[PDB]
Each structure stands twice: as structure tokens, then as C-alpha cells.
Design an enzyme around this catalytic site. Structure first.
Site, mmCIF file in Angstrom:
data_model
loop_
_atom_site.group_PDB
_atom_site.id
_atom_site.type_symbol
_atom_site.label_atom_id
_atom_site.label_comp_id
_atom_site.label_asym_id
_atom_site.label_seq_id
_atom_site.Cartn_x
_atom_site.Cartn_y
_atom_site.Cartn_z
ATOM 1 N N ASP A 151 0.838 -1.199 0.000
ATOM 2 C CA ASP A 151 0.000 0.000 0.000
ATOM 3 C C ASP A 151 0.874 1.252 0.000
ATOM 4 O O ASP A 151 1.310 1.716 1.058
ATOM 5 C CB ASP A 151 -0.934 -0.022 1.205
ATOM 6 C CG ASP A 151 -1.925 1.121 1.199
ATOM 7 O OD1 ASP A 151 -1.850 1.965 0.286
ATOM 8 O OD2 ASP A 151 -2.785 1.165 2.101
ATOM 9 N N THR A 152 1.104 1.819 -1.187
ATOM 10 C CA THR A 152 1.865 3.059 -1.286
ATOM 11 C C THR A 152 1.132 4.242 -0.666
ATOM 12 O O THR A 152 1.760 5.275 -0.406
ATOM 13 C CB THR A 152 2.185 3.370 -2.748
ATOM 14 O OG1 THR A 152 0.967 3.485 -3.493
ATOM 15 C CG2 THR A 152 3.045 2.275 -3.348
ATOM 16 N N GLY A 153 -0.172 4.127 -0.440
ATOM 17 C CA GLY A 153 -0.933 5.169 0.211
ATOM 18 C C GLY A 153 -0.923 5.114 1.722
ATOM 19 O O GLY A 153 -1.626 5.902 2.365
HETATM 20 C C1 LIG Z 1 -1.318 8.504 7.307
HETATM 21 O O1 LIG Z 1 -2.596 7.982 7.086
HETATM 22 C C2 LIG Z 1 -2.610 6.677 6.588
HETATM 23 O O2 LIG Z 1 -1.886 6.389 5.693
HETATM 24 N N1 LIG Z 1 -3.521 5.718 7.190
HETATM 25 C C3 LIG Z 1 -3.952 4.487 6.540
HETATM 26 C C4 LIG Z 1 -4.932 4.781 5.366
HETATM 27 O O3 LIG Z 1 -6.059 4.433 5.436
HETATM 28 N N2 LIG Z 1 -4.463 5.484 4.190
HETATM 29 C C5 LIG Z 1 -5.367 5.782 3.092
HETATM 30 C C6 LIG Z 1 -5.116 7.229 2.673
HETATM 31 C C7 LIG Z 1 -5.331 8.146 3.869
HETATM 32 C C8 LIG Z 1 -4.219 9.087 4.341
HETATM 33 C C9 LIG Z 1 -4.455 9.996 5.545
HETATM 34 C C10 LIG Z 1 -5.785 9.967 6.274
HETATM 35 C C11 LIG Z 1 -6.884 9.029 5.808
HETATM 36 C C12 LIG Z 1 -6.670 8.121 4.605
HETATM 37 C C13 LIG Z 1 -5.128 4.915 1.860
HETATM 38 C C14 LIG Z 1 -4.890 3.442 2.180
HETATM 39 O O4 LIG Z 1 -4.293 2.854 1.055
HETATM 40 C C15 LIG Z 1 -6.192 2.707 2.473
HETATM 41 C C16 LIG Z 1 -5.837 1.293 2.933
HETATM 42 C C17 LIG Z 1 -7.090 0.430 3.062
HETATM 43 C C18 LIG Z 1 -7.367 -0.688 2.053
HETATM 44 C C19 LIG Z 1 -8.618 -1.551 2.196
HETATM 45 C C20 LIG Z 1 -9.588 -1.301 3.332
HETATM 46 C C21 LIG Z 1 -9.317 -0.201 4.339
HETATM 47 C C22 LIG Z 1 -8.071 0.667 4.216
HETATM 48 N N3 LIG Z 1 -6.986 2.620 1.261
HETATM 49 C C23 LIG Z 1 -8.286 3.254 1.139
HETATM 50 O O5 LIG Z 1 -8.805 3.785 2.069
HETATM 51 O O6 LIG Z 1 -8.894 3.213 -0.124
HETATM 52 C C24 LIG Z 1 -10.196 3.562 -0.232
HETATM 53 C C25 LIG Z 1 -10.419 4.142 -1.604
HETATM 54 O O7 LIG Z 1 -10.496 3.096 -2.361
HETATM 55 C C26 LIG Z 1 -11.210 1.934 -1.439
HETATM 56 O O8 LIG Z 1 -10.418 0.633 -1.540
HETATM 57 C C27 LIG Z 1 -9.814 0.427 -0.183
HETATM 58 C C28 LIG Z 1 -10.564 1.068 0.603
HETATM 59 C C29 LIG Z 1 -11.152 2.305 -0.242
HETATM 60 C C30 LIG Z 1 -2.727 3.598 6.042
HETATM 61 C C31 LIG Z 1 -2.279 2.777 7.333
HETATM 62 C C32 LIG Z 1 -3.400 2.699 8.124
HETATM 63 C C33 LIG Z 1 -4.565 3.699 7.486
#
Ligand SMILES: COC(=O)NC1(C(=O)N[C@@H](Cc2ccccc2)C[C@H](O)[C@H](Cc2ccccc2)NC(=O)O[C@H]2CO[C@H]3OCC[C@H]32)CCCC1
Lengths: 99, 99
Positions: free
Chosen positions: A25-27
């Protein structure tokens, strides 16, 4: 190797003597794993996602092997729906985005 | 280009004719942008992540340029903390993970 993004980039990891599947997860700033009982000291932490914050346990200097590539760093443990490998560990395995 | 992950993989995007900064997020199925006005019809939707669900407006077949690469696909607009480019558009610009 190379990983296309047609599907979720899920790989096998090894941590605390267990094999699991986890999302590259690059995000993600940090690595967050599903509830598991790791030994040693930990500290309480709060991490935020798109929907809000969850409580996690922060373990430091934990070894994770990601597709045969080893990485040592901070791992957070809590009620996450998926094991997430974040940038703190992806950098250690030489992982890049390419287009 | 080749992008390392020591810092957040932020790039400039162009959508609706406006420039924005967004995160290349291999851990996102979908693309979710902060609140903005966009032309075209939209349908209400909900997406879940860590912390819970948010309510979003789903725009389909939206033109968006990501770091000089054009994509046309679904864009969710809502109260996300950060602009995230998900796999639905990362695949269109030929983005892969490599290590
Ligand atoms: C510094 O903050 C972070 O980095 N905290 C995390 C995060 O949640 N980061 C998110 C960005 C972000 C950055 C700052 C504040 C809020 C959010 C992005 C992550 O990749 C996240 C991972 C994930 C994958 C499956 C299910 C659930 C969570 N994906 C996501 O939410 O994707 C969305 C859009 O598409 C959909 O499919 C997936 C889900 C939907 C990364 C580590 C822990 C949380």
C-alpha cells in the site's frame, strides 16, 4: 518482481513466525496488521483512515519478510479489515512505483 | 517515471481543468478526491476504509490527467482527508509496483 494493479496487490508475508496475506500500500504511511498477539512491549496509538481513527498497538523493530525481502520496523496491530504494508517497510525492500 | 516511497507519492493531477495534488495509492480500489465542483451527472455512493464509511458523489467517465498521463474513469468526490488515486486509474496510466 513486478506487480500489476488490476487486482489488489496482495502478497504473502512472514511475521512473528506466521504466514499471512498483506496489501502493498503506497498510500499508507505505516504498516497496520490484523489483530495478533505479538510478544514484547508496545505503546497505544491512534491511526486515521478515510472514515476516521482506530486504536492500535505499536510494536517497534519487528521483522517482516515480504516476498522473500526482509524489513524491520514499526508495526501497528489492531482491528483493520486487511493487513497493510506501508511505506515504512516498502522502502526497505526497494519498492517503487513505475509508469 | 520511477517513484521511490521515502516520501508520500504525491503528484499533480488535472481534473475539471483544475490542478490538484493527489496520492498514488496502490491500496485504494477507487479514486476519491476532496470536495469539489465537477461538471456532469453524479450518483450518491458510500465507500469504506479504515475508520468507517464516507458519503461520496460518484462521477463516471471523468477525464483526469495524472503526472502527464490521461485517464478516463470513475472519480468519487467527498470528505476524504487526502486526494487518492486508486487502482481504477493507476491501471489506466500503466502503473506497476516493482521490487
Ligand atoms: C497517514 O494515514 C494513513 O496512511 N492511514 C492508513 C490509510 O487508510 N491510508 C489511506 C489514505 C489516507 C491518508 C491519511 C488519512 C486518511 C486516509 C489509503 C490506504 O491505502 C487505504 C488502505 C485500506 C485498504 C482496504 C480497506 C481499508 C483501508 N486505502 C483506502 O482507504 O482506499 C479507499 C479508496 O479506495 C477503497 O479501496 C480500499 C478502501 C477504499 C494507512 C495505514 C493505516 C490507514
Amino acid at each position: 518482481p513486478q506487480i500489476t494493479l488490476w487486482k489488489r496487490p496482495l502478497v504473502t508475508i512472514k511475521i512473528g513466525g506466521q504466514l499471512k496475506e498483506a496489501l502493498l500500500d503506497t498510500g499508507a504511511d505505516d504498516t497496520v496488521l490484523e489483530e495478533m498477539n505479538l510478544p514484547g512491549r508496545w505503546k497505544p496509538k491512534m491511526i486515521g483512515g478515510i472514515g476516521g481513527f482506530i486504536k492500535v498497538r505499536q510494536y517497534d523493530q519487528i521483522l517482516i519478510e515480504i516476498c522473500g525481502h526482509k524489513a524491520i520496523g514499526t508495526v501497528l496491530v489492531g482491528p483493520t479489515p486487511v493487513n497493510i504494508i506501508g511505506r515504512n517497510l516498502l522502502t526497505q525492500i526497494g519498492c517503487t512505483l513505475n509508469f
